[PDB]
Amino acid sequence: LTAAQQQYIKNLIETHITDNHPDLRPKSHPMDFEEYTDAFLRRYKDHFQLDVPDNLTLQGYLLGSKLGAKTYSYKRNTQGQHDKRIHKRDLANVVRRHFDEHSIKETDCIPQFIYKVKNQKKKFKMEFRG
Amino acid sequence: YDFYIESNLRTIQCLETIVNKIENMTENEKANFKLPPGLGHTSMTIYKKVIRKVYDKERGFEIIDALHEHPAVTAPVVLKRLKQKDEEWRRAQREW
Amino acid sequence: KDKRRFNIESKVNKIYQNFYSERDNQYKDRLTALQTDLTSLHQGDNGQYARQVRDLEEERDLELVRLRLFEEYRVSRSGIEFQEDIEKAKAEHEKL
Amino acid sequence: VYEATPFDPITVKPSDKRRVAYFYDADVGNYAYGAGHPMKPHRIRMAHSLIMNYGLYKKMEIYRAKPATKQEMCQFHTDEYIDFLSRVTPDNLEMFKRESVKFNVGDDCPVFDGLYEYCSISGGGSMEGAARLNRGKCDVAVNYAGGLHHAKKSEASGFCYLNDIVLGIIELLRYHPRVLYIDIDVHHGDGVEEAFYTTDRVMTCSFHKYGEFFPGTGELRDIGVGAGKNYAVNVPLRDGIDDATYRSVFEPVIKKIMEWYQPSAVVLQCGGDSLSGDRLGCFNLSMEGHANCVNYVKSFGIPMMVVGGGGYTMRNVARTWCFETGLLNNVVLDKDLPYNEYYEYYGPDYKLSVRPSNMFNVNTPEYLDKVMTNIFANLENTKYAPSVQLNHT
Amino acid sequence: ETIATRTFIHQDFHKKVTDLRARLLNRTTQTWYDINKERRDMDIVIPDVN
Ligand SMILES: [K+]
């Protein structure tokens, strides 16, 4: 009731109370690879045969605390092993770098796209790298 | 009474795991922490209604925002209020 | 600019043609992939059945961390109540 | 075709044992319709407590089932209805004033925080119970968060917003020819009957109170249209019916249905507004009288899917659900409740009992004889043709 | 109560794991038979008329 808090509260409710249209759901940038389901990341890393470990999902990353440090997951992911998973940000940065450096020129990117789209329902078709 | 109290007692559980984890991490991980909607567990509705019950039906929005963007600053501070109202409300309940 | 349309149709037809020509050695590859997936699912080392078991484990253990922290809080609650009630009994008995 | 008898001690038979899969989700109790509404999900939680503290969890397997998806909801409901459910909150209701008017929303079925999540939990539990029953894992599958049997394909009706039993039976029908549904609420099971009215693969059987009541449907002459004629059984009853009466009406109807319809998957709604002391129902059933139904439907030996329903006095639903769940495990419990976090709500003597009153029974041997004869007559056009080899159901 | 929910946590894990494995087996053997059929369908020289 002081001509500042009024519009403050007004903006708050005008920004948090809407009709939840699916047309307003906040969508992430295409270049930020951390917002990619962590199975896209693993399939990318596994397809281009990169050299990274797998990531810690979110349950394995909050599982790290003095109390959480006694669970089988911590003691299987933090001792001396080779399967030692990592934080999603690291794998996502490796993937992003191999994305911005390895490059492509069309004349083979498009016809492959068309052959892919026109055969979605087919089980027996050209695997474009496998 | 049971509804408000046992709904407080679940946000307590979630924020407790998150604070236990925040106390075991560095400073760059403190400036590089973010939580998705749902705060890492199954439900996406209960903690928000708790937060606007305890704080304000209108200014709990900013707390939930800073809870999603800055979990390292914002949610050892919120957990110490839920624990206060838990004891207040349980006092009143076992009185009546 | 129909030359571009001719190029693209030629390339896509080329892909169809290559696949149909090699269609017999591009079919034992599929079946070896499948037989090795089968024999590796039967053991447990499958690169995809060993990557999701670990998430089902990473999510089982956050459960037990939440369980233990919650039991700690429960015991703290019971202790607070017991302490308050003993203090009240003694103090007001003496006042009486 | 009805002789009244005394009510015999409920007792588990040792020749058959089950593999109970119990479905529970620690979130469900956390939702509330509003200030004074008679619907309280908290009671499901309360029942869980007794199950834990009686030592009953040690002979069954307790699972959280994943919530049901929008496109699993639209197997029975429309897109506009489900989209409304997903988008409406107690805060933006002013921008849905048409849809709220149009989907029967606002006084008997309000919108609370967590409506869509509560519905997801109910539907998920029901469909996962059905799926696990199809895979030959369990014999009985219990889901007390589901049984919202009053919901319409395009409308909210009577404290219910999503018909999870329809989804459950749709999943049960993928592998079964013929499914029976029993509804022992005090209201008529009208959503399920309206949904499966013109078919012969689901037989609905309601035992309700017909009068100046809710919903207003389910007469003795409402028996199905089309190819579904004679595949909808109604038993209308009057106030005051008690354990002996109810048992003598309930057993022969169900036994004749089992002999004729030969179904081989039963769904059982175990609503609790049909108990003495309830705040909306008007029967005079005990806890043993309400549980002998479960015991009888179980004594046959075909896949059962038990669900919740009504019950508006929390204490009594909690106690009768815990007792029924003990009976499904071949266990008659003890009457003294163990200490649990709800060691209130159980005044005044803290026992495993539901007590009947002395109110008067308005149902007499001629009304019931007439009703049951009409039913036994309607219920002989529902057999299987003589050349149709079965799988011993 | 904490003992009981400990048991519940471990039972739910066991359920989800065994579902995982049966589902992956079924998916691979599905893809195999679909490959077989789409292979033989490329062997027809004269189709049916209707
Ligand atoms: K009924």
Ligand SMILES: [K+]
């Ligand atoms: K029917």
Ligand SMILES: [Zn+2]
């Ligand atoms: Zn009812």
